[PDB]
From a paper:
X‐ray crystallographic analysis revealed that TlDps1 possessed His‐type ferroxidase centers within the cavity and unique metal‐binding sites located on the surface of the protein.
Numbering used by the authors:
A (entry chain F), G (entry chain F): 17 to 92, 97 to 173
B (entry chain C), K (entry chain C): 6 to 177
C (entry chain E), J (entry chain E): 7 to 173
D (entry chain D), L (entry chain D): 8 to 177
E (entry chain B), H (entry chain B): 10 to 177
F (entry chain A), I (entry chain A): 7 to 177
Write the structure that this text describes.
Amino acid sequence: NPIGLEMNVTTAVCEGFNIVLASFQALYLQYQKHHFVVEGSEFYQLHEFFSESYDEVQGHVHEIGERLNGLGGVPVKLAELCCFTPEPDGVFSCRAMVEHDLSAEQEIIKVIRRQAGQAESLGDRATRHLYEKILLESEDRAFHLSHFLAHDS
Amino acid sequence: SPIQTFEQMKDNPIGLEMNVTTAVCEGFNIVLASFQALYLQYQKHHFVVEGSEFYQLHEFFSESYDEVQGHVHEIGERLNGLGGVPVASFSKLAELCCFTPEPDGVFSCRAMVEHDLSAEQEIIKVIRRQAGQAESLGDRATRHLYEKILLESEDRAFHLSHFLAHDSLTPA
Amino acid sequence: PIQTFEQMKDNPIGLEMNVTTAVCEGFNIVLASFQALYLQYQKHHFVVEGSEFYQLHEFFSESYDEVQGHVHEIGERLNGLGGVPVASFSKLAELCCFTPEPDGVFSCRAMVEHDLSAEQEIIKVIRRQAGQAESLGDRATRHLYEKILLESEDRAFHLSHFLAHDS
Amino acid sequence: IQTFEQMKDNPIGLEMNVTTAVCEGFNIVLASFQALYLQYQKHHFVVEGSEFYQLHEFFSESYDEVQGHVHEIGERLNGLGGVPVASFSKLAELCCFTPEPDGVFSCRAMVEHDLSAEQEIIKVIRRQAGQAESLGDRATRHLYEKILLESEDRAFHLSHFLAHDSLTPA
Amino acid sequence: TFEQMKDNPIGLEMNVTTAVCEGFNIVLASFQALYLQYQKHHFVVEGSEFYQLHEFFSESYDEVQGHVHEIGERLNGLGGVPVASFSKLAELCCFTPEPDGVFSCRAMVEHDLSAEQEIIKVIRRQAGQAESLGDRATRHLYEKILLESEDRAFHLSHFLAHDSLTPA
Amino acid sequence: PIQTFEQMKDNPIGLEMNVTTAVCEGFNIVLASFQALYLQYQKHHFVVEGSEFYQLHEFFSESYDEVQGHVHEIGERLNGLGGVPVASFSKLAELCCFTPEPDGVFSCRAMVEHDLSAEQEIIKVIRRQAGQAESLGDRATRHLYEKILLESEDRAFHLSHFLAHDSLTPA
Amino acid sequence: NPIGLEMNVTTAVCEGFNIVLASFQALYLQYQKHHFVVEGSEFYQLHEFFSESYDEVQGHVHEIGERLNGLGGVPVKLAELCCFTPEPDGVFSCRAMVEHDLSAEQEIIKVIRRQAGQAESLGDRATRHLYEKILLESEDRAFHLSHFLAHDS
Amino acid sequence: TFEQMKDNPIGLEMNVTTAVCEGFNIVLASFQALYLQYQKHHFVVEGSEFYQLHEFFSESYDEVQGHVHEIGERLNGLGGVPVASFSKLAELCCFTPEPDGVFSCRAMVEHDLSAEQEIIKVIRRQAGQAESLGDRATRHLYEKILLESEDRAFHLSHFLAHDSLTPA
Amino acid sequence: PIQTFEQMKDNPIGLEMNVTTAVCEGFNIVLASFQALYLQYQKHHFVVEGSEFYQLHEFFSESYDEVQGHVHEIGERLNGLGGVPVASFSKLAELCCFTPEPDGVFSCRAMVEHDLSAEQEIIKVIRRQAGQAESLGDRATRHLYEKILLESEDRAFHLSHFLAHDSLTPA
Amino acid sequence: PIQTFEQMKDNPIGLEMNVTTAVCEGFNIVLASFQALYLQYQKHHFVVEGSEFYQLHEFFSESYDEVQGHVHEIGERLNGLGGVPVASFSKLAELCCFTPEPDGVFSCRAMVEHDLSAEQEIIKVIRRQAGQAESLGDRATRHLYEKILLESEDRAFHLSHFLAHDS
Amino acid sequence: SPIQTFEQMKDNPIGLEMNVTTAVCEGFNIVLASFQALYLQYQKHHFVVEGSEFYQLHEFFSESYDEVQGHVHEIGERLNGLGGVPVASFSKLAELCCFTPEPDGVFSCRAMVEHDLSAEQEIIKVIRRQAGQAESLGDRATRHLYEKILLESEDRAFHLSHFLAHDSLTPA
Amino acid sequence: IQTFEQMKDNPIGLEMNVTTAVCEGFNIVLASFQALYLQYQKHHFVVEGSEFYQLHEFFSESYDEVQGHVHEIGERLNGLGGVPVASFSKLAELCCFTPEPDGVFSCRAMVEHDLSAEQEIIKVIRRQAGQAESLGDRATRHLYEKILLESEDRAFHLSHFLAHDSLTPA
Ligand SMILES: [Fe+3]
Ligand SMILES: [Fe+3]
Ligand SMILES: [Fe+3]
Ligand SMILES: [Fe+3]
Ligand SMILES: [Fe+3]
Ligand SMILES: [Fe+3]
Ligand SMILES: [Fe+3]
Ligand SMILES: [Fe+3]
Ligand SMILES: [Fe+3]
Ligand SMILES: [Fe+3]
Ligand SMILES: [Fe+3]
Ligand SMILES: [Fe+3]
Ligand SMILES: [Fe+3]
Ligand SMILES: [Fe+3]
Ligand SMILES: [Fe+3]
Ligand SMILES: [Fe+3]
Ligand SMILES: [Fe+3]
Ligand SMILES: [Fe+3]
Ligand SMILES: [Fe+3]
Ligand SMILES: [Fe+3]
Ligand SMILES: [Fe+3]
Ligand SMILES: [Fe+3]
Ligand SMILES: [Fe+3]
Ligand SMILES: [Fe+3]
Ligand SMILES: [Zn+2]
Ligand SMILES: [Zn+2]
Ligand SMILES: [Zn+2]
Ligand SMILES: [Zn+2]
Ligand SMILES: [Zn+2]
Ligand SMILES: [Zn+2]
Ligand SMILES: [Zn+2]
Ligand SMILES: [Zn+2]
Ligand SMILES: [Zn+2]
Ligand SMILES: [Zn+2]
Ligand SMILES: [Zn+2]
Ligand SMILES: [Zn+2]
Ligand SMILES: [Zn+2]
Ligand SMILES: [Zn+2]
Ligand SMILES: [Zn+2]
Ligand SMILES: [Zn+2]
Ligand SMILES: [Zn+2]
Ligand SMILES: [Zn+2]
Ligand SMILES: [Zn+2]
Ligand SMILES: [Zn+2]
Ligand SMILES: [Zn+2]
Ligand SMILES: [Zn+2]
């Protein structure tokens, strides 16, 4: 390790980095599928939102991956280590599309929080910090999805 | 310690006289107050709208509060230029408001579109009367600025009325 | 009147006059169709309203800009080949591929369907004229036709999504 | 729903007494500007000769300017509650000037034709802007004066295109 | 309505969302007052150095509006309601806004500095609260706003320093 | 000279020379005033110094290019309306509405005051010419005149703001 | 189908669209992993190249996907329908990284060519055309990889 | 070396790569000659309409250089060697370049038009060849270059038309 | 006037007033010539018309803003070197190196030729002042003078190119 | 000399003078270190050559620009808190975290290793000063420290890849 | 039909005389020819380089052929301005070339870097002698343009020499 | 490999007779400009007062200008085959002027200090540019004249910053 962190903590943080990376990759490809297949009266809204969300989540991926390899691990079984349940096959309701996306982001929020706690416990600040950086934007995306799901028109 | 208290103006560096800069200045203050209230309302709507069309309303409300903030900015800069004092207190900003601001709380998307629409209309009438005043009194620049603010705020009210039409790709 | 809308003139790229005449009256057919579709999209941008009025406002406007691009392409290529593009209202109306929507405000539903029908009737002539231009050996024209066709098909796709029964 | 004769209410506080007049003036102006847009586009397409590049680019820039004019006037027109003209029947009926017949004409000829169209659209615009002022609608009078400014500029540039001067000696 | 909270899509309990959303509302109200004041100062500033203060006040009220918008979006997302009317924005504002009327540029800079200081205190404390209840993203947003607010205070103090090219 | 100065020719937009003569005379005098104002603002961008040297450096530059943009608008429209714009040194000298600053460097305050006075008398000339153009039915001239008026009134605002007896220093 | 193509050909082209989409997705994620994990003396070169290549290949993906859903199918088993062999786990030689990438792009080139032939046979031009559009750039990427693999310095 | 071919990373046989790479070399040589000529014309053009031809010649030689670079990169990728020296670039060029010296603008436009026409013929034919041997990407690149070359010829012919604002 | 024209003051870069006086005189005359050239190019952007109206429209505009950029460089450097730049109408009139075009619209060819002659005599003045600045050891003045020379020589090239007896028409 | 490099002055944000003094001499330590590292990266950009000389030319240059950003941040924050930043060569040299590379051209290998060692010695002080500033309640300073630290760690990562044994 | 044959000039619209514009013009033609050859060589190198560092050489060669093309452009525009005729034939472009162009074929990366380097050097000496000539004869602008072309081409040769140094992170 | 005394060969065709001299002049100029960059940066950091914003932004823009100067001169210096100065020992030894001592000084004082530094760096630049001309190296003489132009401009602007004039009356 080339930053002075003990092996102890680098393994433990790369562990969670691969969990969140697999989950974020699943989220990215599912948002991509949604961007592809949405139709209906509000489709355009969703058409853009999904495209703005996957372009967002992959960002997460890359820097996790870039810093994951940085700490001495190997970035990602993408099916094994993913924290949430991926979308089944076929095109669903647009409403269930955003419901699935909602819950996926919620569970990745949770594991990101736990990993930030672990990184803080053992004295590696930057990882905790970056987890917080992603956490704010993913919470924001959850806000916007639930706004999509509100019973109003 | 104030050097130019609210209801006390001075001179203007343009060559106008105070038979009409005073009139145009407190005609400006009304529109400034109501436009500030409308900007705050559009910002709250940007914040809290939800539902089927919520993305459309989100972005439209941000666009519109930026437009009205630009109106506020130029009205205030010109008002200070001609010798007036702009309103800033919540007290007077609530007093001089030409329309009734929306009460606090989340409304249905339709309800806030209606509130916004008639707020716009009631500011449009103030603006037209003040443009007529500025024309009668020989102040060209104020009437002309009023007229272009008028044009694009009428455009804003057009788009607002368009969101309220009873039509859609849905069966409703 | 130096040249009129039936006299065909030579081309500076080395094509024979038969393929010139054929490809160019096809050009003018689908250009008149594209201009009619452009103006339909434009006034639809003007008159659309309702719950989803922002989405369609944007979509209509982008569509009439892209069809304007198509029209400039076909017109420049058409004169370059030695023809003369259509511009009169009467001729334009006549050679339009589809029946334009009658003036007056229609429902947003009906407007979307009018646009999608106009685009499919234009896609028909584009496919056909592409087959033609390929048979006559006009490769650059065929290539142009293919581009215009693909993005017209994509517009048909986004119309198809606008009219789906969901939410 | 609404056809090209019946009018809808306006959400701005203007009376249909004024709306009807300003929107029919608007429709005349829109038909005129659409005819000029098509003419300038054809001119960009078919122009050729020694000064071909100048006229190519000038024709294209002015057709996009008049295009902008039609979007502006059309969106305002709909705002008042009227219905804009679109099909070729009523665009030919309601057009201010006589459009150029089909076929590629001389450089001189179609520059002059554009001057003709611009001049008489200017006539309509100015006097119906006076009308708009009389009706108490300031916003459309202002919009009219901006459009009149830009079209008078276009007429100036065409006017200079057809001046009797050149670097080619007399 | 006001004085009410709905649910949450990120998994925080209402014990934490109510408490942090009240502080968002307070900070948003004071930031809106500071935005209006910075705008008034950009309008009415004049004198020897008036262009400096012109540009600084404009920059500052746009930064403050950015803070306001981020806090408002996050506040509604957390299930609260942002304040918008003048009555509660005057009530809940942590500092006393400048009374109406034109003040001299120096007094304007002093008012802005002390307003920034009080809002900094409120921000620090609500950030501490947010940290104790386990809301880390709120905490992070508060700290970003706090850093840039502290720099705004730095620049105001620099404007207030007793030094010049003039022998004053 | 194929078209002599004071010889106005036909316009291609349908105005009559009774209005074009007057509005081109007005255009030429405000053009001369603005061409002198451009050079004075530019001279101030050159020679200004002092404790507030930076602010007025950039203010004078921005004002001189605003004034010279006014110049292009007025000149292009004027020649569009048959007339000929002023370009001769003596001509502008003649037709300057204000007195240009005498030569040499002055105190920055005196320079701001000179610029303000030049602005203000151009204000008066512009308003009188706008009234003229309105009465004679030339709407576009009056409209351009109006936004020239708006931005130059803003410039005069900023100048007098420079002139206020206030500062972070004692005064 | 909303463009006038018979069901006959739409099914047949969506078939190959999912093959090439799964292959391109595997290629994209593998180029991403390479962008993550490359080290050595020339790493920077590869560091950027991989990032410029995956951003490229995903482009392919999206428009395939956007037009796939367009023809009436459902876009993507990503492991099942992929035409080439994905990378095994761990960080390999940088040379074998680009060798694996080389062969992956070669085989997707081949199936793209066959799908273009099929689309041409049955009269749908735009698909054949788009396959050609992607084919040129993927051939170019193969050129650049083999250039990376040349025995010279 | 010249007159040699190596392997291929995209799976075409040398029966097709040799044959299409020879035509790439021919088209690249003629395009380099046309680029040099358009540049010389941009340099030496003068007269009544000289600014039009100035800008057109510059635009045209940059378009032709784009064609040259795309063909060269694809040619090396296919396993061939691009031509670069003056001897073989003068040999393999399909048209006769303009002799040295300044010509009148009209003769320059005529030379450029006929050069574009001959290169169009060569391009069409090598595109047909490429199609028959199953090289589709080469075919597509050739057709793009052909479309924009045909438009260059269109604009040259427009410059050569007998019409003007002058009564000439 | 706190600093009178023809009264040069101390420079903060270490030159002696023997060289600054001469180079500021030269700067002022080339500044006056370029300030007249800017106005003449601008007048040509205004009043030009004909069959080649478009080309010279944009050429005259680009040339006048190039010339006025020369003006800013020269003026800022001049006041940096103690002197004061010319701004008075009569002053520029005096110190114009060429004869400005008489008033009224001329044929476009005559206007191009007037601009070319103005350019050429500014060429001569610039070269003489560059030799002066070099002999007296002022390298930066001479260097700026040299690129002014380069771009104005390019402008003269383009003007004479306009003047060639050649076209797609018969001549 | 109004204020000198030991007199500390009040802060306008409401912090107590103890945390001011502590956080600000930490600021000056790591700012002097950052400036030394910046100049080392700059002359390495100057003097690097070899087979991979383009990669390193670019990397060195981007690194000395990013460290310049760090230095501006720390200096502005440091004066704002009430301290005075270091600028003299003697003081800068003394308070530099690491031993700067001695003048003269070194191998690209050795230069990369010198830079990576300087960055690790600076990361040490950044981590430590972040812990400090957090203990004293200076939250904005701690946040700044965290940003600077993370991207310094990323630079250490790209150095680590430059020195790997591959190809 | 040529109106100004290669070795036949005319007048220059600047006020120079033909004792030195002729000299500077065919001094310009040499550098134009060699710079055109170098641009073609750099383009071929952009095309055909491969190997360990091939990305670096790829982009560097494109950068450098753009730089030398800019040199060619300004030399040619100024040459036509002062009354000369620019070289364009392959015949004369090969004749007047100051250095020997690389023979056709793919070389090792090192070999083409060496060819490029010494081509640059041999053009640098031509450029310096021509700058001295232009200075002696009183043509300032040509010498100054020569000097800035000189500066950035010396920079190009610096970077070239840097690629050739016997150093690297590899054990070689 | 190469230390700060021995010189390497240049690939441009200049002789070490010239290279040694121009590179030691270069190193003097580089040390001077690095000292001025650090000074301008400190000035941007610690400036305050009534005109604080002016000097803030001016100091920062000029420190980036002198920064550009050091990149330019350093890359050319290495090009000749010399070795650039970097550590604080030789930057303090070889610097043209006396750097400002530590601590925040008056506005007047450090504007004047910057004027001092600029003036004497101008001295060095001009006479050693004359030297560069005598040696037959035209490119570095040209580069020197551009840097001299920009630094004389900076000296002008500082000079005007300290003029005895203000809108605050006397
Ligand atoms: Fe690693
Ligand atoms: Fe799992
Ligand atoms: Fe005021
Ligand atoms: Fe009220
Ligand atoms: Fe034709
Ligand atoms: Fe029909
Ligand atoms: Fe309507
Ligand atoms: Fe009619
Ligand atoms: Fe909510
Ligand atoms: Fe309160
Ligand atoms: Fe005229
Ligand atoms: Fe007078
Ligand atoms: Fe579908
Ligand atoms: Fe498989
Ligand atoms: Fe190869
Ligand atoms: Fe041949
Ligand atoms: Fe001075
Ligand atoms: Fe004279
Ligand atoms: Fe301080
Ligand atoms: Fe130390
Ligand atoms: Fe010539
Ligand atoms: Fe030779
Ligand atoms: Fe070296
Ligand atoms: Fe020393
Ligand atoms: Zn990366
Ligand atoms: Zn949002
Ligand atoms: Zn403002
Ligand atoms: Zn709209
Ligand atoms: Zn076109
Ligand atoms: Zn889409
Ligand atoms: Zn064209
Ligand atoms: Zn619109
Ligand atoms: Zn938002
Ligand atoms: Zn103009
Ligand atoms: Zn014009
Ligand atoms: Zn998409
Ligand atoms: Zn490449
Ligand atoms: Zn390339
Ligand atoms: Zn300046
Ligand atoms: Zn300046
Ligand atoms: Zn470099
Ligand atoms: Zn700063
Ligand atoms: Zn990286
Ligand atoms: Zn050129
Ligand atoms: Zn700052
Ligand atoms: Zn560099």
